[PDB]
Amino acid sequence: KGSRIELGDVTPHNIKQLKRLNQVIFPVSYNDKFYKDVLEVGELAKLAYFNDIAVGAVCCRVDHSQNQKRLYIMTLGCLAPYRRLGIGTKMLNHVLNICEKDGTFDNIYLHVQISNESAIDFYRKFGFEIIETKKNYYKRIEPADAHVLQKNL
């Protein structure tokens, strides 16, 4: 109600906006295959708009591993001047709502570079827990270590 934040679908018309947002927000680069895959995941990928300004995005994929159906969050973020306005919450609530409505997911997980204190704090507010610390997860960036954050459903 009265919200300045809206999510919209990712399409061949606005994929260039998603790529530009991910280039600015994340310290790693994603390939043509990641974006081609994003166009096929439907609701698992969304752009976030603040007053109709594309300022963030979320991209997920269904992961079948550990003999489970898992929702894997690949990228979730928003431009630095728009942080702490609820954009992250709106994107994460969208992914939790798909999982609740579907009912076949065992858990939802993601990787967070250990230096990202803000992202750990953000995810722990939604019931995600640090289940593992993977050493040398990132190839060319420092710190290379990543925490595995998971929420059980």
Ligand SMILES: CC(=O)SCCNC(=O)CCNC(=O)[C@H](O)C(C)(C)COP(=O)(O)OP(=O)(O)OC[C@H]1O[C@@H](n2cnc3c(N)ncnc32)[C@H](O)[C@@H]1OP(=O)(O)O
């Ligand atoms: C799968 C992945 O992509 S892992 C990497 C996650 N993304 C990134 O780190 C990219 C860069 N960071 C970001 O874009 C953002 O800072 C995000 C995604 C972590 C957070 O999204 P935001 O829009 O800023 O968060 P939002 O406003 O919805 O915050 C919700 C709550 O999280 C917590 N939180 C979020 N950021 C912080 C922070 N910097 N310090 C402390 N607590 C925080 C707070 O409790 C906050 O509630 P409040 O603002 O009412 O106090």
Ligand SMILES: CNC(=O)c1csc([C@H]2C[C@H](NC(=O)[C@@H]3CC(=O)N(C)C(=O)N3)CN2C(=O)c2ccc(-c3nnn[nH]3)cc2)n1
């Ligand atoms: C099969 N699908 C999976 O399950 C799966 C497994 S890895 C994966 C994807 C998503 C994963 N997301 C995160 O790591 C998030 C977002 C973010 O940007 N960061 C920093 C963060 O904190 N967490 C990164 N990854 C890469 O392709 C990727 C990994 C490392 C580098 C790199 N470049 N230089 N050194 N290493 C570049 C790209 N998907």
